[PDB]
Design a binder for this molecule. Structure first.
Ligand code: CL
Ligand code: CL
Ligand code: CL
Ligand code: CL
Ligand code: K
Ligand code: MG
Ligand code: MG
Ligand code: MG
Ligand code: MG
Ligand code: MG
Ligand code: MG
Ligand code: MG
Ligand code: MG
Ligand code: MG
Ligand code: MG
Ligand code: MG
Ligand code: MG
Ligand code: MG
Ligand code: MG
Ligand code: MG
Ligand code: MG
Ligand code: MG
Ligand code: NA
Ligand code: NA
Ligand code: NA
Ligand code: NA
Ligand code: NA
Ligand code: NA
Ligand code: NA
Ligand code: NA
Ligand code: SR
Ligand code: SR
Ligand code: SR
Ligand code: SR
Ligand code: SR
Ligand code: SR
Ligand code: SR
Ligand code: SR
Ligand code: SR
Ligand code: SR
Ligand code: SR
Ligand code: SR
Ligand code: SR
Ligand code: SR
Ligand code: SR
Ligand code: SR
Lengths: 56, 194, 237, 92
RNA sequence: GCUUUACUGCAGGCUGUCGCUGAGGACUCUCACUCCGGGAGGAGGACACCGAUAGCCGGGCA
RNA sequence: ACUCGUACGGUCACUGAAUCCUGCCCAGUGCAGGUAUCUGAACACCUCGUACAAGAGGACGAAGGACCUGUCAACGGCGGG
RNA sequence: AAACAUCUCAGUAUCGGGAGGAACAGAAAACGCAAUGUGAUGUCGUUAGUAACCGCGAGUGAACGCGAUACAGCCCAAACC
């Protein structure tokens, strides 16, 4: 079976959902962790300096 | 005449001799069975505490903290490094154990502020320090002419920023002249070369 | 290279774990204050997934129902005893000190009160040899003379299920089924059959370890493969 | 080659010709207190140590004469250029 | 990326030493510490574990 | 983690059902054991040096090596005259 | 660094923790234009690519002082009660 088109038909699982905390569709309903704001992982908000250019 | 305090002090100049030696041999047995941070009603070294600002009053807390002895507990580089940055064993951290101790204590008592700390011995695998913490919200302290300074907003979490006595020493701020070119006014402002 | 299989094991991931949630019970001797007035009745014989051997369910006087490491020759109804005074018959447990020399024993404790450490496998047994006030000498299944505290408890007789090893698996499917009941990754791919990146013996046009197999005791994990600190090899001499 | 142990030649000290005694230069022992010694300790630690991780170079097939020339009257010695010599044995 | 008796290092293991650590080139003891025991208590014991350092091995890794 | 496991165990490897078989080689390399003697670091100790210190040398000497032994279903070898 | 290991890029990127409107520093166990001299601390200009470091290679790199800005000095522990 090819890893492309034929394997795309098996995709009917729900993982990322609208997050209660930030509103983004990034709350992983299985991990119960938001990949966007960090909800479920940390009280503090998910942030990183690499989200922008170094001198900016 | 000599103060009673001086005797406590004089005993602690040689914690390995005399009565104190036997007291430590006994105590450490109990201490080893205590937690990482144990609050205590009275300083083990009264003279030192009072000398550092301690007072028998409301809002003054003292806690003993133990920390693992030795150098750093570092993980080897998982990515490529030049011989220089491959070291793992003989590398030590930049904060002394007393500082690590003051911080753990302050975490245990979120509302309190570290005033000062001092050593109370160690065995072959750990070190103990007692920490004096102050309740900046208690009126008995907001009114003390000798401690109300620690109530100011900018004194919040002072220990986490190196404002402690052990903090300042460890930052190379002792000397006022030669040798402090890169420590004063801050390590960060000097590019971190101190 | 990449970590070898022996190193993947240590992480204790599912692939390398034992089906513990499926295991029946810990077969440690009962704990008695003293007196030996402890007796129970074998209420049933069961199969132990973890050892491929039978185990006996016993109901004790004080109302304690517990599985026991059963020796050969124990059946429902039979009464067992556990204590310093316990009778000297197959299936009973008592400290070595009370056991008569020359008597095959099983489920021997390493340290008095641990519940049993030695001789617990199918059809095996330790042999109590010497008595004393300071040391009970036992001969373990491997043929080793072990000096133990006479206060160490044990069970008279040999472990049930002897001979299990005398019949061959004949087919892979049988190994398969047994392996699925153990904390073991099976089947086994030879080192020599892997790529250089996966094992010290990998690589090369034809298969062959490109090095001697006897490895030093001081070898680090990842390199300690083949014949570990062998005192010798082969069948000769 | 052969070499006289003593002979008349110019002593740059007396500023005149006098008998001299020739001797092979014996290596002087180190103290371990020179600056280079302190730099080795200062600059050697974890990993490679730059120059202090290098090791003794090679050897030339033949070495040059390494001799001391001692004046027979003032007792002082002087050095001269050397010349390649497989062997140097003194006569007497 | 891979290999090795390439160069240089780094983990890791073995080993000595110092601290933990006590009493009377081999020895006894118990009180720290360790382990077994539900507990009493038992086993071991200044060793071992751990911190530091030194020598050896060291494509397991860079 | 193995492990509610304990040598009829389980870990590490090689060969690859049954059948008939599996010779010679331990010099080199590997592993392991032993070791009078040799070599073998640091601390402590001793001498010289320094009113101290740096430093030089000595004595002691662990593992290791030299040396000896075991081992090829251990890496491998089994030629020319 | 025309490779590269010390060095460099750099205490930079990035990560953990924490405060404020600014932070940090700060009233000498200082300096050492050695003096019959200066007098808490930042910072700005300069001192200076100087001293110092360095496969003494490539490169790295202060301070005292001086001219400025702004200026401000105090509180405990103990003795005795
Ligand atoms: Cl604080
Ligand atoms: Cl099996
Ligand atoms: Cl010469
Ligand atoms: Cl001045
Ligand atoms: K680099
Ligand atoms: Mg007052
Ligand atoms: Mg600043
Ligand atoms: Mg059991
Ligand atoms: Mg399985
Ligand atoms: Mg296979
Ligand atoms: Mg292949
Ligand atoms: Mg490999
Ligand atoms: Mg083959
Ligand atoms: Mg335990
Ligand atoms: Mg490589
Ligand atoms: Mg094959
Ligand atoms: Mg095949
Ligand atoms: Mg380059
Ligand atoms: Mg640097
Ligand atoms: Mg160059
Ligand atoms: Mg720099
Ligand atoms: Mg200066
Ligand atoms: Na706090
Ligand atoms: Na240096
Ligand atoms: Na590649
Ligand atoms: Na051989
Ligand atoms: Na280049
Ligand atoms: Na290159
Ligand atoms: Na350099
Ligand atoms: Na001037
Ligand atoms: Sr397939
Ligand atoms: Sr298809
Ligand atoms: Sr699906
Ligand atoms: Sr979470
Ligand atoms: Sr962040
Ligand atoms: Sr806070
Ligand atoms: Sr058990
Ligand atoms: Sr148990
Ligand atoms: Sr191979
Ligand atoms: Sr043979
Ligand atoms: Sr250095
Ligand atoms: Sr080095
Ligand atoms: Sr040459
Ligand atoms: Sr066959
Ligand atoms: Sr051999
Ligand atoms: Sr002023």
């Amino acid at each position: 079976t090819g890893a492309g088109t034929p394997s795309q038909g098996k995709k009917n699982t729900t993982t990322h959902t609208k997050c209660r905390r930030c509103g983004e569709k990034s709350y992983h309903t299985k991990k119960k962790v938001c990949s966007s704001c960090g909800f479920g992982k940390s009280a503090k908000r998910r942030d990183y300096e690499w989200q922008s250019k170094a001198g900016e | 005449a000599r103060s009673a305090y001086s005797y406590i002090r004089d005993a602690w100049e040689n914690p390995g001799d005399g009565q104190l030696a036997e007291l430590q041999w006994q105590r450490q047995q109990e201490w080893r069975n205590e937690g990482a941070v144990e609050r205590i009603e009275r300083p083990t070294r009264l003279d030192k505490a009072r000398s550092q600002g301690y007072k028998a009053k409301q809002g003054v807390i003292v806690a003993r903290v133990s920390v693992r002895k030795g150098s750093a507990r570092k993980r080897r580089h998982k990515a490529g490094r030049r011989s220089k940055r491959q070291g793992v064993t003989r590398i030590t951290r930049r904060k002394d154990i007393q500082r690590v101790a003051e911080e753990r204590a302050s975490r245990t008592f979120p509302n309190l502020r570290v005033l000062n700390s001092y050593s109370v011995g160690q065995d072959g695998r750990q070190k103990w320090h007692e920490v004096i913490l102050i309740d900046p919200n208690h009126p008995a302290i907001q009114n003390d002419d000798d401690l109300s300074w620690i109530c100011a907003d900018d004194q919040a979490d002072r220990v986490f920023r190196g404002l402690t006595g052990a903090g300042r020493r460890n930052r190379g701020l002792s000397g006022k002249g030669k040798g402090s070119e890169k420590t004063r006014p801050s390590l960060r402002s000097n590019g971190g070369k101190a | 290279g990449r970590r070898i299989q022996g190193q993947r094991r240590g992480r204790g991931t599912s692939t390398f774990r034992a089906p513990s949630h499926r295991y029946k019970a810990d077969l440690e001797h009962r704990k008695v204050e003293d007196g030996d007035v402890i007796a129970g009745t074998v209420v049933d014989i069961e199969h132990d997934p973890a050892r491929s051997a039978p185990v006996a369910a016993v109901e004790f006087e004080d109302g304690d129902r517990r599985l026991i490491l059963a020796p050969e020759g124990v059946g429902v109804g039979d009464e067992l005893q556990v204590g310093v005074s316990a009778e000297i018959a197959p299936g009973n447990t008592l400290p070595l000190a009370e056991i008569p020399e020359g008597v095959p024993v099983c489920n021997v404790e390493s340290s008095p009160g641990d519940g049993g450490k030695f001789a617990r496998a199918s059809g095996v047994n330790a042999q109590l040899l010497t008595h004393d006030r300071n040391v009970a000498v036992v001969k373990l299944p491997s043929g080793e003379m072990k000096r133990l505290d006479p206060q160490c408890r044990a069970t008279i007789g040999v472990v049930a299920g002897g001979g299990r090893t005398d019949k061959p698996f004949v087919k892979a499917g049988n190994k398969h089924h047994k392996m699925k009941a153990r904390g073991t990754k099976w089947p086994n791919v030879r080192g020599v059959a892997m790529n250089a990146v996966d094992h010290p013996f990998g690589g090369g046009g034809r298969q062959h370890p490109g090095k001697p197999k006897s490895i030093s005791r001081n070898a680090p994990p990842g390199r300690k493969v083949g014949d570990i600190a062998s005192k010798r090899t082969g069948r000769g001499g | 080659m052969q070499m006289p142990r003593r002979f008349n030649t110019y002593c740059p000290h007396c500023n005149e010709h006098q008998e001299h005694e020739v001797e092979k230069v014996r290596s002087g022992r180190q103290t371990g207190m020179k600056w280079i010694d302190r730099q080795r300790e200062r600059n050697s630690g974890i990993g490679n140590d730059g120059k202090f991780s290098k090791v003794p170079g090679g050897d030339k097939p033949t070495k040059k004469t390494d001799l001391k020339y001692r004046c027979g009257e003032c007792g002082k010695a002087h050095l001269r250029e050397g010349w390649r010599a497989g062997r140097l044995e003194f006569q007497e």
